[PDB]
Write a protein that binds this ligand. Sequence first.
Ligand SMILES: Cc1cn([C@H]2CC[C@@H](COP(=O)(O)OP(=O)(O)OP(=O)(O)O)O2)c(=O)[nH]c1=O
Ligand SMILES: [Mg+2]
Ligand code: NA
Length: 270
Amino acid sequence: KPKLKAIQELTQVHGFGPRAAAALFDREGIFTVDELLQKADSIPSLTDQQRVGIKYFYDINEKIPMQESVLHENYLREKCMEVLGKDFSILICGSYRRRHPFSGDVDAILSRTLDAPPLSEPVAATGVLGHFVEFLESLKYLEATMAQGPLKYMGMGRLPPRINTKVYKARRVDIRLIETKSVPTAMLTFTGSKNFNVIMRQAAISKGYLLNEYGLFKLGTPEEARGKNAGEELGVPKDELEDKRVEVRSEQDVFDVLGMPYAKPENRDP
DNA sequence: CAGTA
DNA sequence: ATACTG
Ligand SMILES: Cc1cn([C@H]2CC[C@@H](COP(=O)(O)OP(=O)(O)OP(=O)(O)O)O2)c(=O)[nH]c1=O
Ligand SMILES: [Mg+2]
Ligand code: NA
């Protein structure tokens, strides 16, 4: 049992799951978070992402008050306009959009507007997420990176000091780049809650649909339906899946097609 | 697969 | 339930 308490302890750190916690206990004799923090630098196996979880342990365990999330929203929207221009927009989802007084992180969607001209390739292929991230890094807002690819960024963002002088904690910031036609389904997914998404996706299954952030897809009967995911690359469904899309313009559209009563974001905590 | 949205 | 990065 000694290593069971250790695992439950060590998995409190961002980037450490049961597997990594066991290795720490067995190969390092480390059994407390406090020891992990004091020793991390002398452990070479740790990845760059685990190192961020350790360095920002204090900040990461503090919740963000709604008033500060409003400031992150305004900041990201302004910087988006400055460096990407009017073709793009930022929307903050997660527990903030569900109107919780506190949130664990900042969940942002970056997407092209309905008015922006259509592209000839997936928007992710333009490198735009990386350009936006570099801009935020030059401003010293983004100060550490956990993971980054062409669709999803996870890092630590800190609002600049405001003038007495107010100094802010670094916060977990997640940015997802989403195609225009996928925005209504991405708003559903990234607003959650987690349990709400599972319930709605189960409802889809029962009616012969696939629901994800990219769309609502009508698969048909259980047999007609029959490797990384259901069939998307760079944020775009493969043609065979795209052909199944039921176009939607609003969250309400999705509730309606699935025969579920509409719920406001603040009522999505089952 | 591990770990996190 | 379904998905992205390492
Ligand atoms: C974990 C998880 C999350 N999601 C969606 C649904 C929510 C958003 C945000 O995730 P968060 O963990 O930040 O959720 P949040 O509700 O924003 O709460 P915090 O206040 O940030 O903890 O992602 C999911 O589909 N499957 C999952 O396993
Ligand atoms: Mg969140
Ligand atoms: Na963890």
